[PDB]
Design a protein around this nucleic acid. Sequence first.
RNA 1: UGCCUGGUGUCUUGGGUGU
Lengths: 98, 549, 84, 93, 105, 174, 268, 171
Amino acid sequence: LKHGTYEKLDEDGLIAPGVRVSGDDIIIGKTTPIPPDTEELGQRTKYHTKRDASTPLRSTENGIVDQVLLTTNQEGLKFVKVRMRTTKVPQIGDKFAS
Amino acid sequence: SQFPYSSAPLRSVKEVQFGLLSPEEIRAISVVKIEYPEIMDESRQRPREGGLNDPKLGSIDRNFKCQTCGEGMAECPGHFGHMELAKPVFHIGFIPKIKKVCECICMNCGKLLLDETNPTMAQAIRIRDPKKRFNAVWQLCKTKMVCEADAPVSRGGCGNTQPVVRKDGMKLWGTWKKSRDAQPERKLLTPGEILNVFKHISPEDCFRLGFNEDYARPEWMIITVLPVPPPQVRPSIAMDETTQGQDDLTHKLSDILKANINVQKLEMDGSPQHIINEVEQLLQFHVATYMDNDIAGQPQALQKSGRPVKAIRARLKGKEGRLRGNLMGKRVDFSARTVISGDPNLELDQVGVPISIAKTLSYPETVTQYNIHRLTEYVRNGPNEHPGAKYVIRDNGDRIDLRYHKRAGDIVLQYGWKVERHLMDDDPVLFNRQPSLHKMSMMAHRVKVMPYSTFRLNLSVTSPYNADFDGDEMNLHVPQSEETRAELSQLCAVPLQIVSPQSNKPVMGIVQDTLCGVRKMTLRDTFIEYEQVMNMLFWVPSWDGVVPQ
Amino acid sequence: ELAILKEERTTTPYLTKYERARILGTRALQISMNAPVLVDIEGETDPLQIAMKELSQRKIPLVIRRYLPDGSYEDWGCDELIVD
Amino acid sequence: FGEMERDCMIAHGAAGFLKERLMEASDAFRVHVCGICGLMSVIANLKKNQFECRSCKNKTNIYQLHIPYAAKLLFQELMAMNIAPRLYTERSG
Amino acid sequence: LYKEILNVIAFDGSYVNYRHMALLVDVMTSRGYLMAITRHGINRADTGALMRCSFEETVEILFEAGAAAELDDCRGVSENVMLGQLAPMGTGAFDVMIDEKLLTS
Amino acid sequence: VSTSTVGARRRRAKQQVDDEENATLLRLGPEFALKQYDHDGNEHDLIALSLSESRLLIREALKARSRARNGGVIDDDELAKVTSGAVANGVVKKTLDYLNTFARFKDEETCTAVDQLLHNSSDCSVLHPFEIAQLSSLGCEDVDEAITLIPSLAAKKEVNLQRILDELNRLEDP
Amino acid sequence: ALEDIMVHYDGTTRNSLGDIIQFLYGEDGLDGTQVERQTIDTIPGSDKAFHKRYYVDLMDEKNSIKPDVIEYAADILGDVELQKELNSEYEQLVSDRKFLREIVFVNGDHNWPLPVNLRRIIQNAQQIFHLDRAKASDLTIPEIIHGVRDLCKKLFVLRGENELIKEAQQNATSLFQCLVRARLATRRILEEFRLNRDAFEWVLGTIEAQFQRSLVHPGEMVGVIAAQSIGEPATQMNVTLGVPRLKEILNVAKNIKTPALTVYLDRE
Amino acid sequence: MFFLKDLSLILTLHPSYFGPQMNQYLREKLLTDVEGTCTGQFGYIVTVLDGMNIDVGKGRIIPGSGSAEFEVKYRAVVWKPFKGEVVDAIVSNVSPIGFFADVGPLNVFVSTRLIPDNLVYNPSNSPPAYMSNDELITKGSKVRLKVVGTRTDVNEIYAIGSIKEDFLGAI
RNA sequence: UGCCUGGUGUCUUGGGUGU
Ligand SMILES: [Mg+2]
Ligand SMILES: [Zn+2]
Ligand SMILES: [Zn+2]
Ligand SMILES: [Zn+2]
């Protein structure tokens, strides 16, 4: 798993709009199946069958989740888009021009 | 101290001796023989032994140890394997030299066409440099077009007429003037014939030709056994979460091995010469393009995607090649980059560093009895509070991360440990702007930690850097040792660079509005009242506390 | 054989800036590795400052070996090289 | 830390800083070389404390070096092309 | 050669110290003939193969060195840079020994 | 760990048969060749040591070190205990026990006379030092026995082997 | 091309092969940062001005040192040995003038970069020792002559007693010795600068120390410095000129764009 | 067989020992690290001659690590067995697979296949021995054996002896 | 007593920033 936090995800693996996010947080939760190992020996169903393929927020960016879009691609599979919003106030080093 | 202990003595390279690899040495240094073209055993992990991904060649997986040395991925250097060629092939990089050597010697008796009896030949042999010696010997013996079975007394020759050799791609044509005009025959000079001719060259003749008996023997220019590089040289890449991609070298080696298998199968079963020629020429092409894919005069080897194959030669040349892009200049750790800004209130040799950059970068300070108290305070403060620390390094080399330690207050520092403390004030750091046209483009400043996210410079140093504050960015490099810190503070420091050796004149002066204001302020009709004079005098750091009359 | 006798030493009798920088760095590193200090320390704590104080008093126990182009060398003590 | 920065560091005369930048702050690596053949073919097993060069059949005349990983890669790629760069820790004249 | 170089540099009023141009024109004419500052001039010296291959014609130089069994003495600065060693320059142009005589105090 | 004064020995192509260790063939390898070099690089001969000479040298060196460590103020057990290192102590104990239980000559003058006889002799001027050490060590009694034990002396028939053996037996303390 | 060139401990400038490029860096062994434009005073001016400035006559009263500047003006006139010393000094000055005017600088340019600024040293001495006031100096002429003569032999660029080493050492400081003798002449010291004794030894010691400090340091990578110093102006810049001409020069092109000759005709 | 050899050692010293007693400390460190060691190339180093007057020279400071490196040259007594050499021994153990003897610091194992057949191993004897009608070799018995093979280990040497030829066996 | 995770493609191309 990614070192970020998964606690902001909903039941369907998608974050909800209006939630403040920080760098490395997980905004899309996705897993890919993996052939199980011999852990079925004595593991009480607690054996790894899936591998994480989640999408984390960029490390240097943070903001508010603005709008989450869920639809189907041309192939009929699920397809999501997450838009993040933040405000940038001028500060020392910002470039201006006439 | 970052490497696990090894009892072998540690020394430094003093000489690099070049040469060719004999087939005996290739077989000796190898650890496995590569013969099966299939990369994967049954697509069920555990790559096939004897294949291109044999576990004995080395390990590139974290949980898999090398079966040859037993070391981990971080320590295994990779081990070579060898592939036996069914028929010898030319080395693509030595074909012109092979042609020259064929012109210099007789193709039957394997002896030089000229002897020391000729004064010019003896003069040429007298020279020392192997390349110039070979050039002179070739210039002389080129003219001699017939072997002499008798002295020009027997000189050891066979008396046969020497053919004229012409190059055509990877094939060499030898034309004999068989016996005014008659019918001459030009026949192909196969690599095997040239190889067995070269093996009969005497060591003295080999030395006369510029080759070295011990290190560069002429017949080693024909490839009879191929070394297979370890997977470290040709790592695989995971294109997506499921399918990984074989490297270009791996595919080329698979093609070469398939061609070798095809030649071996064809030879034992049935031998139409046309088919043999076609298949052996295919093998020669594959071996040649595996090492050089820019051979002028013939089409390049292409991938299934249509892109040309990245041969080994292409890996070493250009700006992005090995030498220019990874050895002469490489990406480095402990560095920062951000926009620069001006600060009139900074000394000449001071740079303003943001707090976040100061927290990210670090300097390993050895714990002694002069600073153990301060370093313990830094360790307590942790990696988020300035001044703080990021790691504690023990004598054995183990790193203690202070982010993930629940008992940071329960750490006692012993003498000789290192604390990777945060960047602090008056730390010398190297500061740089590209392009670095002259040596004043890299100078060492003293750190001053400041808020906001830009590097800050006294405006007098904007001239040597050729920098202004309209968006320029500059690079900062942190020394990581006492020796390096001393070198920076004693050699590259900004005050030492004021006068340049290019024109023996200063490179830094008063600039911009300070220059305008020192012209306006020093006019003859500028008078200043007492209350403003007091403020102006207090602003001078070096003022001695006496107001002038 | 390769060593040059003290009477026939012909190199400069001054500490060049490269030699000064290298000597200061090496001495600072050694002090940071708990080497004995040959001068009294008033209130100084920085290894580089202690090394500079040692150098000013000609107390650094190091020897410079200057390599001539032919391979011969001259051994100069840091206590007999003039420092500016 | 490109070539022009390397030239500036040469002009300053700071050899230690250049070595540290290109080794410690970058790809530093440790290899073992045979004292006879001069090749990086020593099969070193640090935990068992045994070193061995099969080609020369020796167990003693073996040294270790600290070289950039890119240099090791370059020498291995040269060996892949039948060129043998031999590293020796003593001069001969 | 010095006169021509100085004429080129000083046309726009710029000034470069004499010793630099003197060094350049002494390098260009040190072999008895004019040595152009190109691969055909620099790479035709007796310097180490590793130093020469770092400029231009890397692979061809490496093959020529291998076939001729060239020996590189690792005296240059490029050789020591690409091997991660202390170059024999600046602060690396000497050795520091330990003074067992002075430590007796 | 320790390195001999002989260095270089780089790669070549020829292989020789005089490389393998063999006492009978008197092939002792490069590091034990007949010609050696000292710290000054001058010519030096291989220095073999018989059990008498080895015992004399080890006893002298050990007692000198013991005297030095006590400020310059005989028992083999105490002498072994002088050295440092438990494994070193055991090794020197074993060597001392071997030398004592097989010492043919425990006197300095007897060993000196034996060495003079085995060196200054005209016949022995060609004898290899290893052969001399073996002769003084094994304490052979017969020409046939010595030849069987030392195959090298079989090819050297210009040696007064029997009378030299009798001289050694005489010098040997009964 | 120039990377592997470095000043060695014997003063020579060699590449990595050990081949000599120069027998002395910059032909004087100095560092590029430790030189300044100075005027050599023996070059310019007519013969009458040179004679008036430098000649001292102890027989003619009105052509001698002024009596108010020296305490010992009474027992100077009529001395013959001191006149011999002064004549030797003046002959040395005339030889320097001839050497500079006929060999080194034929066009008469006298403003050249030279080490240790003499004017700054002299005015520092004047400020330090309060050399104002009409007070008479106590500096005897033989002290001046011998002090300057000895100073011109302590400017060590090369150490050693070898004869060839001594010849190279003498060659390396010819121009600087000419400058020093031009400035520290007897008449100029006694009249123009009015130094006393203590100022004189201070000036001599300062000149020697500064010259020792202005030498080049073994271990300089002068090749890279030269390459950078030549390439830096090129980034900021009928015959061909500019970058194309520099490219023609460096490549040693056989057929340049505008070949030309400069034919000089005979005097008539 | 014992020999005199001129050996050299590389000694690295930590800066914390840079004191007036540096030379003597290097001497004892050399003695502790050389006396009694076993190198396959040379054999066994038993003693170092002139152990208190060994020249150490001038140590070189390792760039970047501060520690000084010393090159110490010394003369030492070395013992090394050779293939095909006959030497005296003392039996240390008796076992059905063969008997183990000691030649100084070296322990030599002789298998039954290299022992004359008449010397049948007697386990009933006290102590058990390989005995014949006129020969009886047990623990502590002097034996003359010929070394046939030597095995090289990390810091150990294993030799194999034989008594199957003439003038061998019990002495 | 229920007990805590560091591991990140490659190759092309295109548009830009500062000289
Ligand atoms: Mg700008
Ligand atoms: Zn491995
Ligand atoms: Zn012929
Ligand atoms: Zn080897």
